[PDB]
Amino acid sequence: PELPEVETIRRTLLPLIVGKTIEDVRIFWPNIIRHPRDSEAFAARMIGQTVRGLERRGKFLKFLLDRDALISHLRMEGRYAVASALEPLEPHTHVVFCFTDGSELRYRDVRKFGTMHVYAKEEADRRPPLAELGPEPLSPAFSPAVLAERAVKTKRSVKALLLDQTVVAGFGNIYVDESLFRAGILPGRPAASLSSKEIERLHEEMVATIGEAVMKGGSTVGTFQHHLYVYGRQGNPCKRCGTPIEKTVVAGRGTHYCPRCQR
DNA sequence: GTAGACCTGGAC
DNA sequence: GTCCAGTCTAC
Ligand SMILES: [Zn+2]
After folding, report:
1. Is A62 a catalytic residue?
2. Domains in chain A, start-ordered, CATH in brackets?
């Protein structure tokens, strides 16, 4: 789950929960709760509060209640669904919010990597994990200049730079690989080796790629999966030149690229 | 930069 | 049986 997928969840989930009041909060895997550390305090404070809105910051979902804000990160497999509280739960359900109208919001996560933090609204943006996030890619706050200031000071791979949420917030393995192919830049090259022209081109493709993915409802692996040039296509012909797509390891992640179209 | 952690189930 | 799928620590 990257920005496009999280933004899709935010849009579809909002009307299904806005205006409902919390009656109970049940937790089956405590490690997911990060703040307050004590699961009992986490549950108690939300009882009686009403859902007023749902926003997104980077790859995080921000549930807006009365006094508090619930900050949730899905990591690799987290997912949400709304259903009747009278039916048996599905496998791997670790947290459930029960509403006064008999419906409930369920959180499932097979690998158990997800996290949840609760803070008073006016403290959320000034505390971890939101405090140190970079700017939103689809906002004027993200420009070629911002990307250069960070790139010109480090020799780490350009892919490692784009995956750093403090540089820009929202890109993950799929959209970093896709943006670099569109820009014609190899993922393993030093960020400082990029020319001014290459930085402007990369910025342009990053905004175009992420924006297009949001419109298509994200990648299901949504319909953006039908528009991928390299992710998951190792061994198949490049859609632009016909050369076989390759896969290696960069910045500790599986990496896909075309040896002819990219640097 | 690069294995090891946190964790579980599918593909070969 | 062995390999593969967002972020933190540790040498
Ligand atoms: Zn190509």
Report:
1. no
2. 1-133 (3.20.190.10), 134-263 (1.10.8.50)
